[PDB]
Design a binder for this molecule. Structure first.
Ligand code: HEM
Length: 280
């Protein structure tokens, strides 16, 4: 039982885009770090049907890179609009106690909104990783547009998990006009623009209760004109992909870094990579 473990998470509202082939950077591996757990969440369209037949390349390329580095894929789960994969270094796994479990929650009859939770235990500590997806137009258990449901929140369980991460596009946006938002971006007044971000409003409404986001120092990750760094100002620049963390049991979770990956310009959103150190 080590004293600490490291976790990398990445999420990307990737839409109809295929997985990139350059993955080390996406997963935070390109400077030689060797995290214990890696979670990858995507939001988009057509994953399960997989008309593009891109599933095969995803498996090949992720498994090619990660197996050589000592990772085991605990689970991949896909729906039409969401994907969540969790990897862990094989050296941490005790099959007798791992209790690897995933649930899918769907909130609409077309199964386009809801979320996924994958959980597992190592060294007698329980990890849970959630992703979620909500539409602006949906009727919901919260009567909000935010991608929260209590069924996805393993901190509000009778026996809450030790380490919890929630990654993806939460459908939280910046609630001001585009002109003001862009001016704050140009001034690098990130905290000033963050004053208009809806996560605090969601929390006031008792969504994401007690969940923390690492400090944001990067510019909004949406909406870009593809292959550029220029905002498409048809939308107010916003922080779409987010990483939130919590412990149900008083364990320390220390973010090490939290950044958008601006080299992945293929789409209107930029991926967001978080790195944490957890104390068992
Ligand atoms: C940036 C975008 C994407 C990322 C990061 C991504 C990531 C992943 C990851 C990490 C896995 C698990 C790989 C493993 O086995 O180790 C996976 C599986 C899969 N992905 Fe993607 N994916 C993306 C886009 C897509 C798209 C556009 C499609 C097609 C609509 C798709 C279809 C699938 C399917 C069907 C699987 C499961 C296939 C199987 O289990 O044989 N993905 N993806």
């Amino acid at each position: 039982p080590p004293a600490q473990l490291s976790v990398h998470t990445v999420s990307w509202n990737s839409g109809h885009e295929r997985a990139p082939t350059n993955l080390e950077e996406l997963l935070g591996l390109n400077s030689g770090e060797t995290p214990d757990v890696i979670a990858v969440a995507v939001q988009g369209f057509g994953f399960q049907t997989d008309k593009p037949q891109q599933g095969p390349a995803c498996v090949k390329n992720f498994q090619s890179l990660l197996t050589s580095k000592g990772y085991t894929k605990l689970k991949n789960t896909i729906t039409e609009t969401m994907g969540l994969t969790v990897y862990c270094l094989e050296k941490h796994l005790d099959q007798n106690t791992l209790k690897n479990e995933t649930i899918i929650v769907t909130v609409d009859d077309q199964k386009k909104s809801g979320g996924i939770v994958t959980s597992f235990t190592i060294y007698n500590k329980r990890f849970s990783f959630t992703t979620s997806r909500m539409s602006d137009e949906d009727v919901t258990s919260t009567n909000t547009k935010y991608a929260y449901d209590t069924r996805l929140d393993y901190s509000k369980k009778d026996d809450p998990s030790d380490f919890l991460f929630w990654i993806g596009d939460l459908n939280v946006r910046v609630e001001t006009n585009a002109t003001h938002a862009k001016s704050l971006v140009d001034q690098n007044n990130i905290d000033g623009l963050m004053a208009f971000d809806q996560l605090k409003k969601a929390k006031e409404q008792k969504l994401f209760d007690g969940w923390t986001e690492p400090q944001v120092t990067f510019k909004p990750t949406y909406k870009f004109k593809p292959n550029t760094d220029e905002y498409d100002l048809s939308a107010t620049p916003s922080w779409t992909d987010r990483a939130l963390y919590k412990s149900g049991t008083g364990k320390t979770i220390q973010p090490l870094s939290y950044n958008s990956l601006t080299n992945y310009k293929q789409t209107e959103h930029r991926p967001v990579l978080a790195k944490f150190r957890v104390t068992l």
